[PDB]
UniProtKB/Swiss-Prot annotation, chain A:
The keyword rRNA-binding belongs to this UniProt entry's keyword annotation: yes
Family: Belongs to the universal ribosomal protein uS11 family.
HAMAP family according to UniProt: Ribosomal_uS11
Top-rank taxon, per record: Bacteria
Assembly mode: Part of the 30S ribosomal subunit. Interacts with proteins uS7 and bS18. Cross-links to IF-3. In stalled ribosomes contacts ribosome rescue factor SmrB.
GO molecular function: small ribosomal subunit rRNA binding; structural constituent of ribosome
A Gene Ontology term for the protein's cellular component: cytosol
PROSITE patterns: RIBOSOMAL_S11
Alphabetically ordered keywords of this record: Methylation, Ribonucleoprotein, Ribosomal protein, RNA-binding, rRNA-binding
Cited InterPro entries: Ribosomal_uS11, Ribosomal_uS11_bac-type, Ribosomal_uS11_CS, Ribosomal_uS11_sf
Disulphides: none
Organism, scientific name: Escherichia coli (strain K12)
Name this polypeptide is given: Small ribosomal subunit protein uS11
UniProtKB/Swiss-Prot annotation, chain B:
Role: One of the primary rRNA binding proteins, it binds directly to 16S rRNA where it nucleates assembly of the head domain of the 30S subunit. Is located at the subunit interface close to the decoding center, where it has been shown to contact mRNA. Has been shown to contact tRNA in both the P and E sites; it probably blocks exit of the E site tRNA. Protein S7 is also a translational repressor protein; it regulates the expression of the str operon members to different degrees by binding to its mRNA.
Section covered of the full-length record: 4 to 152 of 179
GO CC annotation: cytoplasm; cytosol; cytosolic small ribosomal subunit; membrane; ribosome
Additional facts recorded: The strain K12 sequence is shown.
GO terms assigned for molecular function: mRNA binding; rRNA binding; structural constituent of ribosome; tRNA binding
Subunit structure: Part of the 30S ribosomal subunit. Contacts proteins S9 and S11. Cross-links to IF3 and the P and E site tRNAs.
Keyword list, A-Z: Ribonucleoprotein, Ribosomal protein, RNA-binding, rRNA-binding, tRNA-binding
Entry's family note: Belongs to the universal ribosomal protein uS7 family.
Organism superkingdom: Bacteria
Name listed for the protein in its UniProt record: Small ribosomal subunit protein uS7
BP GO annotations: cytoplasmic translation; negative regulation of translation; ribosomal small subunit assembly; translation
Amino acid sequence: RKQVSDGVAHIHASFNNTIVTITDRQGNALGWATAGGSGFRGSRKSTPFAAQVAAERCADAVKEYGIKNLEVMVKGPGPGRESTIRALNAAGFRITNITDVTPIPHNGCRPPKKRR
Amino acid sequence: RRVIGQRKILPDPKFGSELLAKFVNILMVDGKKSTAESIVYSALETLAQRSGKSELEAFEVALENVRPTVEVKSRRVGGSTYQVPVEVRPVRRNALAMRWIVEAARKRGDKSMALRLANELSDAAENKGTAVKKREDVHRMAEANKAFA
RNA sequence: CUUGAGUCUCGUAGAGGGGGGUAGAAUUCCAGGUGUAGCGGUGAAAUGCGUAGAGAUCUGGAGGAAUACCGGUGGCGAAGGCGGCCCCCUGGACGAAGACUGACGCUCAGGUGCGAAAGCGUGGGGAGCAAACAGGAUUAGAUACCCUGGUAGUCCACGCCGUAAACGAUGUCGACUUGGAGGUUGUGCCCUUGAGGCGUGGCUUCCGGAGCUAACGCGUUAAGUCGACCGCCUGGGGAGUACGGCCGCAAGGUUAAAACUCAAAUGAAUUGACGGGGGCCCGCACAAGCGGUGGAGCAUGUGGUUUAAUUCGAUGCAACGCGA
């Protein structure tokens, strides 16, 4: 729609999945596409190359807003997820800040059990 | 762990060419020095009969386009066998070039070894034959897949 | 008689307990938007939210849930245990000086009290998370992992029970003990001559010295040398088991056997193998290059086959131009 050229990106670096959402500084959704939404399933979707191709198929379709500079923060214990932000940097999204806002529990919610 | 210097070969007693002595040794089998000399010297004289000048640099200008620059050497690190492309030394480039030159002279399709090799020298001088084919073949397998380099 | 024990004055550190709300991330719900075909989770998959339009963030709010950042073998307590924030009542320890009592003290079967978690009764909340549980997906049964959901349950008051590797497997009160380095609470002397060095109190953590122990090991906090008191053990299995007594809404708990079986059971520390761990090197063992065995014909041996008999031995790198 409008011209942005400078926004922000929030990622959900899950264990077996990856979510991305780009926003223009106020909560408007611009770009978003997971791994399991482009015919990519199985462990093939669990590779950093899947993050590469997710970034690519986001960027080639969301340039309707014209973003050149981008803010981002790495979020989640995702294996190899700086690759997708470097692909954004390679997708024409000239990066401006790389930080981490991973929400750590404050022993407010009891952590669930894991594989025995 | 062992390391030594290259074998002290005697240069060619006629033209004084150590790199060509290395070639006439690469080619020689069963130690038939006399017949091997009598065929290669005659074929290189047939090279003077081919162009009509003092053929001494023609060998070098022909081999300038059959020397490789990239080689693959398999090294299994990290599960599978990686290819690890590595540069080839010029002193080994000359050897490999002469190897590709000699590994196509026998299947030329001429009357005799001397004749077919005299023809193949001029052939590789203008970038044709199995030698140049293998040169391009090794140039494309290595460093064109730099993701592994 | 006053050193033990207490009493007085002033301060130090504080996650000891109630009662109250309080702020931030988060995450279920509610509404408004902006935007679009997807989200959601598996070594894969499917289940499950979506075309009046799904997630996801923006604005705000309800719900309950515990306080990361200080966070520290860091502090506190008789033990069991305590962490956002503040207050009232207090529970305990320590420090700086000066003064009083007359032995008032330590231990302690019963008894009383406190007492991890799990397990109940009454009255409530229960957002998220999580024993059981429906069901889906590979499936001659998966009832076992993996995934979204989920009952008590964690939470809140009043009451039930008293069991743990409740361990420092080391009961309590004391007398005399060579050092170093730090954790934490002190404050004196002389010049605070930017946070100054020496002596003087405590509680502690990592090493070792004589000493003790079967060894490991303990070693100013003793498992060192001694004084006073309480509990526990007399081979293993049955077994902390039946029958009892008491307690208990229930689970059962406490005290607590015998007939029968065996000749062992058990702690430390060497020397050993497990079969892969983990690391360091040799050998044409590999990678680069040469001719080769395997393609073909012929000589020769081996197993089969054949026969009246086709004489015997030999068999993975070490059997097959081997005895010959």
